[PDB]
Every structure is written in structure tokens, then in C-alpha cells.
Amino acid sequence: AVEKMAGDWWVTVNAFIDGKEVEDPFGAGHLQMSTYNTASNSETEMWLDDLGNFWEYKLKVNVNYAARTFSTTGFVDNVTYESKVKITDGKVLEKAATTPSGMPADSIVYMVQFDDDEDGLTYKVSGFRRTGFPADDF
């Protein structure tokens, strides 16, 4: 339904601190996450899931399949724990990233904010689709 946008991803999380984009400020390294279809196989929305590896959030995001973009309408309820999350400028590009083994792979990028982040940072989540090859895991 939103097949090319559902996936298992390896991502890093940057943040905009004091106007500048800081590379992996938390030292979290490469993290796994997933995007998948709703139970209804909806064409207009899908699930975004950090698998508990960063802020511990899981929510439905609006999807425009033709554009291959995704986002939420403001801050939406986190399903993992009681908090709200806002996703902005999500984009899946086909074969745009390069895996560690030197092979093209789909890329995912999005901006996220959390209503319980007292520092009010906007974070930039970015990565590539997991190949399943051990050479491409972290």
C-alpha cells in the first residue's frame, strides 16, 4: 500500500543546537528503526517507530505516496508512552543513500520534536534501508 515507504532503517540523529546542526550530539551512533503499514493497509498514513532506541516513540504519520513524503499535523500522541511527537518534512528517496558495503539503498530523512523535550530541540533523523547483510549492520 505504502510499500516503498515501509521499511527497516539504520539511522543517526542530529540536532539543531544554537543554530548549527550538531552531528550525533548524544553519541548514540547508528540506530535501528522501522516504518510500516497500518492494519488497514492505509494509503494515506503509516507507522513510524524508533523501536525504543532513541526517545521511545511510535506514532502514525500522514503519507503522500506519490511525493514520497510524510509528516504529522502538529504534535500527535505517542503510543509507546504518554507524550506527543511532531514529525516534519519526511522523505524517502529511492536508492539515494549508500550502504557501508558500497551499494545504493533507499534513504529516509525527517525532522522530529517531542513535547517533553524541555530543550525544545528539532532533531534530524537520517539513514538508509537495512540490507540484511551483516557488513551493513552496526
CATH number at residue 133: 2.40.128.220
Closest CA to 102 of 133, 79, 73: 133
Structural domain containing residue 37:
1-138
Contact predicate 108/127, CB 8 Å = yes
**DSSP state letter for 81:** S
Burial of 102 (0-12, 13-18, 19+ CB in 10 A): exposed
Which residue has 498514513 as its cell numbers? 45
In order, the DSSP letters of 12-43 are EEEEEETTEEESSTT---SEEEEEEE-TT--S
Structural domain count, the chain: 1
C-alpha to C-alpha distance for 131 and 42, rounded to whole angstroms: 25
| Structure obtained using | X-ray
Buried b (16+ CB within 10 A) or exposed e, 39-66: eeeeeebbbbbbeeebbebbbbbbbebe
